[PDB]
Amino acid sequence: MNIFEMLRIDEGLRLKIYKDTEGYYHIGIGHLLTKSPSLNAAKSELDKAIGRNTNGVITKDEAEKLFNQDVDAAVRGILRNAKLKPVYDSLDAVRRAALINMVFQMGETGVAGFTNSLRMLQQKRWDEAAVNLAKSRWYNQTPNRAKRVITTFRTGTWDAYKNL
Ligand SMILES: [Cl-]
Ligand SMILES: [Cl-]
Ligand SMILES: [Cl-]
Ligand code: NA
């Protein structure tokens, strides 16, 4: 188990444009195309991202390319953020994956907003952080995924992703 396998479980794989739980156009392994309500806008973003006229469908190789790019971007976002980097640097490797997962889902800015949870993580107050993380729109909107990520922060193991 590693961050790529973890996010492939949480996001799935779809080779056609789809809407996520917020109703936004995505493709592949949780790649956000646009927040705009227009499917035409989303097709245009896709063709721009892939470099060809896709007509809304990509191959598995294309999905995995976007995914590699997106994981790299999430990591870079953490390291260039002054609120996230110190937390990341304090964490063990498994808990680092959990933080990358959150940034992949919500973005660098959204996670940097979890001020109190971040402080608790930096202090290694795992049970207190777990409770605080669950008091969120995030948890209420995507509770099964939030629970897996929170369990990962609580325990520092991959147990939530085992048996899946
Ligand atoms: Cl892109
Ligand atoms: Cl709390
Ligand atoms: Cl969920
Ligand atoms: Na994403």
Contact 30, 69 (CB under 8 A): no
Q: Which ligand is nearest to the CA of 142?
A: 3
Using the mean position of ligand 3's atoms as its centre, give its distance from the Cα of residue 143 in Å: 5
Maximum separation of any 2 CA atoms in the chain, in Å: 49
Q: Which two tokens stand for residue 47?
A: 């063709």
Q: How far from 113 is each of 61, 117, 158, CA to CA, in Å?
A: 34, 9, 25
CATH code of the domain containing 75: 1.10.530.40
Using the mean position of ligand 2's atoms as its centre, give its distance from the Cα of residue 8 in Å: 29
Residues of the domain holding 147: 3-161
Q: Which two tokens stand for residue 133?
A: 């993380």
Beta bridge partners of 28: 14
Using the mean position of ligand 1's atoms as its centre, give its distance from the Cα of residue 49 in Å: 4
How many domains does the chain divide into?
A: 1
Annotation marks residue 127 as catalytic? no
Distance CA 30, CA 94 (A): 21
Q: Which ligand is nearest to the CA of 105?
A: 4
Contact 59, 15 (CB under 8 A): yes
Q: Which ligand is nearest to the CA of 130?
A: 2
The DSSP line for 41-86 is: HHHHHHHHHHTS--TTB--HHHHHHHHHHHHHHHHHHHHT-TTTHH
Contact 10, 101 (CB under 8 A): yes
Contact 138, 161 (CB under 8 A): no
Resolution in A: 1.6
Using the mean position of ligand 2's atoms as its centre, give its distance from the Cα of residue 136 in Å: 10
Annotation marks residue 20 as catalytic? yes
Contact 27, 33 (CB under 8 A): yes
Catalytic residue among 10, 11, 45, 108: 11
Reduced to 3 states (helix: H, G, I; strand: E, B; else coil), residue 4 is helix
The total number of residues shown for the chain amounts to 164
